[PDB]
Symmetry: C6
Subunit: 108 residues, 6 copies
């Protein structure tokens, strides 16, 4: 029961989430402004975080908190509709123009 597996990254968005009103401990632990909804994206390969941050900014009026190409994460802040618009555009671009597996937009 031993097998060689050549490990490469898959192509998927695992999380596309909006936190409508984060608690103060979340703004503090994130080092961000204590206002606005939070957009959280999880992507593979990790390098696609730069593409998703570009789409998020181009889609709506948002403030990029971080573009992490080392963990494949993107965080941004703004009004709840601006944050949803960026998440929607990220999911639409990665599914329709990149052929990535995508999850639905989740809200909390």
């Amino acid at each position: 029961d031993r097998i060689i597996q050549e490990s490469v990254p898959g192509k998927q968005i695992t999380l596309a989430h909006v936190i409508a009103a984060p608690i103060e401990a979340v703004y503090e632990a994130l080092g961000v402004d204590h206002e606005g909804a939070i957009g959280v994206v999880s992507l593979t390969p990790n390098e696609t975080a730069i593409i998703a941050a570009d789409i998020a900014g181009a889609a709506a009026n948002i403030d990029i908190c971080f573009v992490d190409r080392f963990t494949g994460s993107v965080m941004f802040s703004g009004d709840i509709q601006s944050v949803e618009t960026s998440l929607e555009d990220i999911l639409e671009y990665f599914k329709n123009s990149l052929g990535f597996s995508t999850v639905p937009l989740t809200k909390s």
Copy 2:
């Protein structure tokens, strides 16, 4: 015996635990006040730690010790019923609204 594996993160909570009465060494090696129960959460993708910390704080009177989006871990302190309430709300949101695989609430 050789296969290419496209690696992506799964969606699951692997640990939702309460340590009812931690030992002074555990309080010390964590940089916390030497009183109250400890809530420990393990999540995948690692980005979901921010969501779980938000739900924990909104559910009950907790003190977030850390929100680690790099390791997908959350740790908080409070009374044993407050800590259990936050763990219960984390598990019920991730199962019912996110479709994540969840473990039961464990106590030590």
Copy 3:
């Protein structure tokens, strides 16, 4: 040479439950601990369970936690060989019976 998507999540297991009855001086210096006593070494997955295992180990005889590493899923402790074995036995018993984790036997060196 086919291709398969693998959703990676951590498994639930203790991979090492070990006691070193009398470590050599170089082991104590690399660790940076008191130059006396047996060494308890635990390897756990998920890595967050290191805090739980430290608690349960500390819930038994004269233990000195050398480190609780939630980043690597490791726990180290120094005490008398029977105190160290007791801690290791309790960790294995709790994780198997109350957590449903796969466990290895207590090993001695």
Copy 4:
């Protein structure tokens, strides 16, 4: 089911992308000159980033932003056709002379 998996890296380019006109927060978050298109490459094994950066520079007159052998990533800037030429040459060399699995050139 329980199986031993000998983990070795696979041989593939997972992302060969051009961001035609990045937003100012992308230039800022990258620490690069606020001008030109952005080329983004994801490779496995991570060591092949040095080979791809050498081919990118030899192919067109780009400006290498980073060659990351720790993450297997390459980022470069230049005119959109120079960036597309470098990406095309990287894909061509890796497929035809290295036997690596390659993705198509993507644009955003």
Copy 5:
């Protein structure tokens, strides 16, 4: 072709090697004394590096260069027969008393 895989570390020694007479660049890159043979061990789980360093010291007259519990590596120096003795004792203990998969002693 999509599967959830619960990842845990396997139990094995992947390398038990002696470099009889290393070149000066190898002593330089390792930050070690420019004298003696080099013993190199690769182990999984990474925590077993402390066990293997204990056996290596107890088995023969060696000078531990590093005990890396973060990478699962052990490096030691000494006369070629002392280094071989330590490697042999590490392999014998891990196979017979731990049930780990082992490789043979290799020399260069």
Copy 6:
């Protein structure tokens, strides 16, 4: 669709490459002397980087740029024939004396 995978490192050289004449941006991003060909090696387990650096130096007149036992990478510089000789000797030793899976010598 859930399987436990015991992860251990495989034994293979994934890249044995010579860049005959790197561009100045490559010498720069590497922090090396602006002269000579570049030898690039990718190995698993990561500890075998020390063995490969020793063989490279013993085989031909090369200057080790880095021996990375954390990433399993080796980089060296010298004349194109010295660099090819060292790559050939690493591939020969790892296949014939270690039983590692090897790739061919690639040139760019």
